[PDB]
Structure 1
């Protein structure tokens, strides 16, 4: 908006500002290790304690 003033200065027309805001994408990585012998007995079901 504007103000009207009695002063001799020119009045200024209606004005709008159009503003663009942009994203930021961030990337996150973690790592895990698993033993082969550990993965071995998982499939079978145990019989002896």
Structure 2
């Protein structure tokens, strides 16, 4: 906005802004017993099995 005092005039301006992503990683560890993975595949024998 111009005005009538002795101040210098104002040229038009421009602003240029740069933004970027941030990478984030997540990890969880599960252990499964070897007998538990095995007997999911072993065959049915009896009602107690």
Q: TM-score band, normalised by the shorter chain?
A: 0.7 to 0.9
Q: Could you say which structure has the higher helix fraction?
A: 1
The count of corresponding residues between Structure 1 and Structure 2 is 47
Deviation at 1:44, TM superposition (A): 3.3
**Structure 2 alignment gaps of length 5 or more:** none
Q: Which runs of 5+ in 1 are unaligned?
A: none
Q: Work out which structure has the larger RCO, using CA pairs closer than 8 Å and 6 or more positions apart in sequence.
A: 1
